[PDB]
């Protein structure tokens, strides 16, 4: 679990979005595993606007942060799960690092701010949904 809070927006994994997120829907994209909902309170986070390929992510299954080198956002095949059929997920970045299903939502950050959230993984890999291209999150 986990979310990004920026301005009057909450960014979460689309497969973990609550009834309240869908009732306050701003934008969602199944191909990216993202959903953005509106909030009443002002958010705590800054979004990075950069081309970094190194950063640090939070791994809830270890209660720890780990440094990572990650690929540029791209279209990557993701196996069928209980939430989606087998498909190409877009704007996805992979890295070597530990992850388990419940780690989705953990934030990846570089020196400029929030880069994205954990969305996929397996066998010593961790995949992050990029948010740096969503310029409208800051107005």
**Residues taking part in catalysis:** 15, 33, 104
List, edge to edge, every strand of the sheet that includes 113-122: 64-69, 54-59, 107-110, 113-122, 125-130, 87-96, 74-78
- Residue showing tokens 């989606």: 84
Q: Is 15 in the site for Zn ion (CB under 5 A)?
A: no
> Could you give the string, one character per residue 14-53, with x where binding to ligand A1BQQ holds by CB under 6 A and - elsewhere?
-x-----------------x--------------------
Q: Which residues contact 77 (CB under 8 A, 6 or more apart)?
A: 86, 87, 88, 89
What is the pattern of x (binds Zn ion, CB under 5 A) and - over residues 78-117? --------------------------------x-x-----
- Neighbouring residues of 85: CB distance < 8 A, sequence distance ≥ 6: none
**Which residue stretches of the chain are H helix?**
19-23
Q: Which does 104 bind (CB under 5 to 8 A by kind): Zn ion, ligand A1BQQ, none?
A: ligand A1BQQ
Residues numbered 80 to 119 that lie near ligand A1BQQ (CB under 6 A) are 81, 83-84, 89, 99-101, 103-104, 118-119
122 binds ligand A1BQQ (CB under 6 A): yes
């Amino acid at each position: 679990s986990g979310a990004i809070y920026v301005g009057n927006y909450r960014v979460v994994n689309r497969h973990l979005a609550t009834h309240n997120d869908w009732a306050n829907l701003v934008w969602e994209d199944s191909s990216r595993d993202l959903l953005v909902s509106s909030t009443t309170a002002q958010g705590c986070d800054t979004i990075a606007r950069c081309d970094c390929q190194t950063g640090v992510y939070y791994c809830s299954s270890r209660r720890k942060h780990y440094p990572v080198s990650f690929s540029k956002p791209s279209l990557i095949f993701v196996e069928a799960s209980e939430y989606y059929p087998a498909r190409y997920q877009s704007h996805l970045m992979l890295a070597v690092g530990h992850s388990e299903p419940g780690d989705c939502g953990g934030i990846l950050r570089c020196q400029h701010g929030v880069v994205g959230i954990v969305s996929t993984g397996g066998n010593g890999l961790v995949g992050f949904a990029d948010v740096r291209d969503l310029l409208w999150l800051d107005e």
